[PDB]
Design a binder for this molecule. Structure first.
Ligand SMILES: CC(C)(C)c1ccc(C(=O)NC(=O)N[C@@H]2O[C@H](CO)[C@@H](O)[C@H](O)[C@H]2O)cc1
Ligand SMILES: CC(C)(C)c1ccc(C(=O)NC(=O)N[C@@H]2O[C@H](CO)[C@@H](O)[C@H](O)[C@H]2O)cc1
Ligand SMILES: O=c1[nH]cnc2c1ncn2[C@@H]1O[C@H](COP(=O)(O)O)[C@@H](O)[C@H]1O
Ligand SMILES: O=c1[nH]cnc2c1ncn2[C@@H]1O[C@H](COP(=O)(O)O)[C@@H](O)[C@H]1O
Ligand SMILES: *Cc1c(COP(=O)(O)O)cnc(C)c1O
Ligand SMILES: *Cc1c(COP(=O)(O)O)cnc(C)c1O
Lengths: 807, 807
């Protein structure tokens, strides 16, 4: 149908059709008479998977022969989503599979909806790992993603009576055609035990063993025949009254059972610590095995890079030391030199409650040798600080890896900085804040260590796959090369006054909105006006992300309508979606508030179709691919200095939405690229937040001076949005009035005013679309290909390559 | 190589080779350079599996079209063993696969050894179900095997310091290529809750739900293109703080985790009760669904037969009533008529400790509605007894399904007789004992209900597969038809004086013994003399099976050698193998005794190679296929009246061993078929055991009157067989002297004398072999094809058919 989806050649279509039928018969053991749409999905999945295999085997043997430096990306999260369409796109099979399935009497889009998301992540950090895997394969790097194969990923979110309900994400129920179990490569991981000192060093003895079984998933590059590996570990009990002993195997296998869904507050839970060590210990054995199959560990950093995605795999640092010192018998200083040159650490937040600080007593019991190594790292590190800053005793206590107090803790971020040659933030403003605030002491000691690597998203999934209509109209003008070189989108600026292109951009958006409006009715029975402004905020529910500020605007619009009903206002569909961490009470209250506002707003006859408030249930990668192409306005309204980067912001920019946002995270660089005149910027900057903190933030002041804000707070308190439980939202009101860390009231006035400027522009479709074109055209910097190329050159010491491998 | 293994045509060999390579590449994701023998096994398994699929789909659709009466064989055990060779044999692919693999540079026999046994059973009862599945497919019956997919089958047995150690049988670790998961056909099973009475009958409410997910395994008939289904249920939790709730899913899924390995003593364990209901509830929903896809349940018994393998699935009876009465709204009397005509029950033991008697309080909590139904069945049944035998109050308490006492129990055997139209024993003597002793009252009420169905074994696995050499020399003389018509073996009697045939039979046995002698050295480092008499007792360790009597003979031979060292004795290799139930202390002591005897006997220089005692570790189906073809003497020495049938006895007879045994179980019919002169019969008959019980069994009498027996007991007591723990075997001595239920001493003298007659004949190879020929020639009755044909005609009301389906 469309050009960017590849060729539908007679020979390939014929071939796909027969392999589809072969799988339906031999693989699924079904005939056409009893086959369901799910059976047809699996037959297609296996057919497409066949095309990966040859390339997968030859890529991996190519690495064995040529022995390039290997990149190991360690993460507890890989938020992969669906694999079928992505595979077709990267292999140039989409039009051929569409044609083949059409000829068999099937709709491929319907078959695509059957696949479960691989939801092995919480949000941005997990999705970043997924985009990075795609870019690393596309750039021809010898890269491996290492993580945990959770049996249950992020919970499915049900909304019952306006409240979030969690249910198990049983994503493996019908099987996973993409993975290959490798039980032959199972490795032992040790826990507990004790440390024995002998003539020849320390020995870790009397341990309990858990087996780590790898499952490999192919990661195809974009049309370069490169297929890399994501290896995820599954926990297995070793084979050595009777009935109970067998049933107790579950205890060991619980390690890989479920993803921890708390993304707001660090809890030192033992099972989580086991998960973190499990991935680290199994992965490092793999790394060393592969290195030895190339005695001398001087070349180790020349052949290995380990990237730590946050501090979650930080135990890699003392584990590498343990292996080099205890097992390989290297002296401490040499082992440390190797470790530092091998490891690099990425930080994703400055919020203190989201930083890992493990109680010493847990590490003492679970990993006694690792604690000894950490103490030794700390002593040697603090000797360097003391020599650099003589007599500065407070610096010594501030920089210590060991935190004293009620309970002693290890600061995993401090461990990571000490043991890494590079530390990066994820957007320019974020990396600056790190140097000026929480890691200031470390920056003063080792300035060379600190870098910025602004985040990005893959334009394969986040344009070509989810928005083929926009990809096509772009390709008509400038060709197809931009898909792996997103900077080429700048060429679109010469079409900003092109009447045909303006109309096409606006047409693609309208089609996306109609399609999403139809999805909503079919799947959830909710009716929206497709001519309204699609006002979208989708992301995990957090106080810092300020879904509450959005809520206040929505109520303001409602109250204004009720005051002057016969006055014209630009119609809006306000959509808010995202999951809340199960133990995050305030986030769960915010979801309830959103639905409660909807219950009042959506049923007021005076409002009509001029304002609709919808909570988007079960927000996940597959839903993002649907809603983002349909959005007109992207809400990126975190308190300045709190959102390290954001990546959803970039997805919306690439897909033709305009952005309303604070000068926070990557928003700053986005506005810089597009021009501030083409962005809806409002609110306090970081410096204004700082000035307000020094003075003391008093929410009462805003309540007293803004009548419209007062009315909303009174409405909340009095039970206007909860008639049968008048005090339902008292926690929210109390927080806003007395202990709001994120200064919602302080940005209210400027936010509302900025929103009026948005409505004013939307009234002029031609100028709206021209501003959209200016955004899409300057979104090139935010490709994860750019991000990964910078990691490769500036941290890993390897050169990217767009050169194709033989098919 | 050999004729019975089929054709190796140029076209088939070429085809198998390329499909092997396709699976290695696309299915296993491996290249020849890194592939291991295990990879090669899996590639072959998938290639052979492909040939099943077409026939599997067409067999099942044929049943849907023709709608024949369906046979449902319900068992908690299916002792399947390995599947690869059996599949090749039944599909006539063995020579072709041998040739194809040879041309690829691989040894197929080596690849065969890689496959794990499906050890989903304990012993004879579980293996009977497996043989029955093979025969039902071979006889063209629309038969389904229904059971539980245990994650862990019968434990692997390790011997450490002479003691049995158990370890988990992780048979699914590398995957199972034979099964197909059918998650789309998952069904709910209910537990706990309470019973609510309404206007329209009872309702079972407030239950906990566990999901039953089916896995289907193909069961190919012998060269008839029939492929039936074995459906095994796996337990799954339904999808509806957070972390713990997810981890607690294990509780539900534990139902299908492990096979209970106690085959000696009934323990009323709750998890076992859950297993029994789980298989029954899921299976019956399947049966009813399939029946409704043919309102009127009058035709139900015309379209459905349910065979209960022991009382383990006895809950089928009240569950069928529950469904018909509570859900389908049939009146009680009609539902009962249907139930009785549908169900049949097979008994496998008369030993009271092995009979299921479930505590009322467990059933009350777990299955409250089923208990109500059982009580109602009992009241109506006892009203019939009272009308038939007026005033016989003791009969009423004897026949009750409810047993009064300290704890009230349900007698599941009584439930089965009441609710079945047919009750059978498993050998003629066994079925007679049932009528005369434990089920006498029931036989007097309903004589028509009671039948015999003498057990059998499949000649595919137990001759063609495990003993191809013997199968071939038989086929040379009489052709190949005997493989599915074992009675044709009678034609071999005209070759009893044929000098060529005598030599060939003796040659095949010698080759089998050399091969097994080599297996022992290679896998266990034990050295045996292949010219000795192979004296074999393999079966589960039980007091009734009297491995202890064998032990006493072995010590007698040793003591006789030590007394007269320079006297000639026929050299023997005495092999004893079998697992003991983990909680069966006496059985574990018996294993220790066997190894302890070996430790003394095998290292005495005076003995030389004249006597060797070996414990065969980890006895299982795959080991039986190796040792049975190598045996000269089959030990079948249970106390008369205790072994219901035996099936191992039949395996040895088919494979050219002579039998030493008591007149117990099927031994009686075996001796009848072969002629008593061609059997080594010794010991008390059932009547002699009865006379001894009435008198009172006093072991001291035998000790006092037999000097050779006294010496052995003194040796045991004094620590001759345990120098470092002199009192190690005190439990065994005490049992033998004071509380031996199985009268080991009473059969000692006749056993030893009979063993001398065996040695005398072995000294004359020609006459030994002629007696062997007489046994093989008359083993035809003991084919499970004969057994199943009798079930089909006399119980199920269906006609067998050797007619081939189109390929
Ligand atoms: C330590 C613990 C509380 C368990 C925890 C666990 C997970 C998270 C988590 O999911 N954390 C994020 O997604 N972090 C996100 O990372 C992306 C990518 O750089 C950024 O764009 C975004 O600004 C940042 O908030 C945060 C905290
Ligand atoms: C009730 C419980 C104690 C759990 C239990 C569980 C399993 C068994 C068990 O495995 N039981 C047998 O194998 N029984 C065997 O069945 C075969 C086939 O008919 C006969 O040849 C043989 O004589 C008989 O002992 C016996 C008892
Ligand atoms: O020892 C070897 N000989 C030949 N190829 C090898 C060897 N080891 C690894 N490979 C290749 O590398 C791949 C496996 O890589 P690895 O398991 O990640 O180390 C396989 O697909 C092989 O093609
Ligand atoms: O409704 C039907 N239409 C056509 N074939 C059916 C239907 N139901 C069952 N079958 C056939 O019967 C087989 C499944 O049988 P069942 O699941 O055991 O009842 C399938 O392989 C089909 O070929
Ligand atoms: C991109 C993405 C995120 C991250 O969004 P932010 O607005 O940057 O927090 C979270 N969840 C999903 C499913 C995503 O795709
Ligand atoms: C045949 C068989 C049995 C049954 O043997 P008996 O001597 O009849 O008890 C037990 N286990 C296995 C593995 C068998 O093959």
């Amino acid at each position: 149908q469309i050009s960017v989806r590849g060729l539908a050649g007679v020979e390939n279509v014929t071939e796909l059709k027969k392999n589809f039928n072969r799988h339906l018969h031999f693989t699924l053991v079904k005939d056409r008479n009893v086959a369901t749409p799910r059976d047809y999905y699996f037959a297609l999945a296996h057919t497409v998977r066949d095309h990966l295999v040859g390339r997968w085997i030859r890529t991996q043997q190519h690495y064995y022969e040529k022995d390039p430096k290997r990149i190991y990306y360690l993460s507890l999260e890989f938020y992969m989503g669906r694999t079928l369409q992505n595979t077709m796109v990267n292999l140039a099979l989409e039009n051929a599979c569409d044609e083949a399935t059409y000829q068999l009497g099937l709709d491929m889009e319907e078959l695509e909806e059957i696949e479960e998301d691989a939801g092995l992540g919480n949000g941005g950090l997990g999705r970043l790992a997924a985009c990075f895997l795609d870019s690393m394969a596309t750039l021809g790097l010898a890269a491996y993603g290492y993580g945990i194969r959770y049996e249950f990923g992020i919970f499915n979110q049900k909304i019952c009576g306006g409240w979030q309900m969690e249910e198990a994400d049983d994503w493996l129920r019908y099987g996973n055609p993409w993975e290959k179990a490798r039980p032959e490569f199972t490795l032992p991981v040790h826990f507990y035990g004790r440390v024995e000192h002998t003539s020849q060093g320390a020995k870790w003895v009397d341990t309990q063993v858990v087996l780590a079984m790898p499952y490999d998933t192919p990661v195809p590059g974009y049309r370069n025949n490169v297929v890399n590996t994501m290896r995820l570990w599954s926990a297995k009990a070793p084979n050595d009254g009777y009935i109970q002993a067998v049933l107790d195997r579950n205890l060991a296998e619980n390690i890989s059972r479920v993803l921890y869904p708390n993304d707001n507050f660090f809890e030192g839970k033992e099972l989580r610590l086991k998960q973190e060590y499990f991935v680290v210990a199994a992965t490092l054995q793999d790394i060393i095995r592969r290195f030895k199959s190339s005695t001398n560990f001087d070349a180790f950093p020349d052949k290995v890079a380990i990237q730590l995605n946050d501090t979650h795999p930080s135990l890699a640092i003392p584990e590498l030391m343990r292996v080099l010192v205890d097992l390989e018998r290297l002296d401490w200083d040499k082992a440390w030199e190797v470790t530092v040159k091998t490891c690099a650490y990425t930080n994703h937040t400055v919020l203190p409650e989201a930083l890992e600080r493990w109680p010493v007593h847990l590490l003492e019991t679970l990993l006694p040798r690792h604690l000894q190594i950490i103490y030794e790292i700390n002593q040697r590190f603090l000797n360097r600080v003391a020599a650099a800053f003589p007599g500065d005793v407070d610096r010594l206590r501030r920089m210590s890896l060991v935190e004293e107090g009620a309970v002693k803790r290890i600061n995993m971020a401090h461990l990571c900085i000490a043991g890494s040659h590079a530390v990066n933030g994820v957007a320019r403003i974020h990396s600056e804040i790190l140097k000026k605030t929480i890691f200031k002491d470390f920056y003063e000691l080792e300035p060379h260590k600190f870098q910025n690597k602004t985040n990005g998203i893959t334009p394969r999934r986040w344009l070509v796959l989810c928005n083929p209509g926009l990809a096509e109209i772009i390709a008509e003008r400038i060709g197809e090369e931009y898909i792996s070189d997103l900077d080429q989108l700048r060429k679109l600026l010469s079409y900003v006054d092109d009447e045909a292109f303006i109309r096409d951009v606006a047409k693609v958006k309208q089609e996306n909105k109609l399609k999403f409006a139809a999805y909503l009715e079919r799947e959830y029975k909710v009716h929206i006006n497709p001519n309204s402004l699609f006002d979208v905020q989708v992301k995990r529910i957090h106080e810092y992300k300020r879904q509450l500020l959005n809520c206040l605007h929505v109520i303001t619009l409602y109250n204004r309508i009720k005051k002057e009903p016969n006055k014209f206002v630009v119609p809006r569909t306000v959509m808010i979606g995202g999951k809340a961490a199960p133990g995050y009470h305030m986030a769960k209250m915010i979801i309830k508030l959103i639905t409660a506002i909807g219950d009042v707003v959506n049923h007021d006859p005076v409002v009509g179709d001029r304002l609709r408030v919808i909570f988007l249930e079960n927000y996940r990668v597959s839903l993002a691919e649907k809603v983002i192409p349909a959005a007109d306005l992207s809400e990126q309204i975190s308190t300045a200095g709190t959102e390290a980067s954001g990546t959803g912001n970039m997805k919306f920019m690439l897909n033709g939405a305009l952005t309303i946002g604070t000068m926070d995270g990557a928003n700053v660089e986005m506005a810089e690229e597009a021009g501030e005149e083409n962005f809806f910027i409002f609110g306090m900057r970081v410096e204004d937040v700082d000035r307000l903190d020094q003075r003391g933030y008093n929410a009462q002041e805003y309540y007293d001076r803004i009548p419209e804000l007062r009315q909303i707070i009174e409405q909340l308190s009095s039970g206007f949005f909860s008639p049968k439980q008048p005090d339902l939202f008292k926690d929210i009101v109390n927080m806003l009035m007395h202990h709001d860390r994120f200064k919602v009231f302080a940005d209210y006035e400027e936010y509302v005013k900025c929103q009026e400027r948005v409505s004013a522009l939307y009234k002029n479709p031609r100028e709206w679309t021209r501003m959209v074109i200016r955004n899409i055209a300057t979104s090139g910097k935010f490709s994860s290909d750019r991000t990964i190329a910078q990691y490769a050159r500036e941290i890993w010491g390897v050169e990217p390559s767009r050169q194709r491998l033989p098919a």
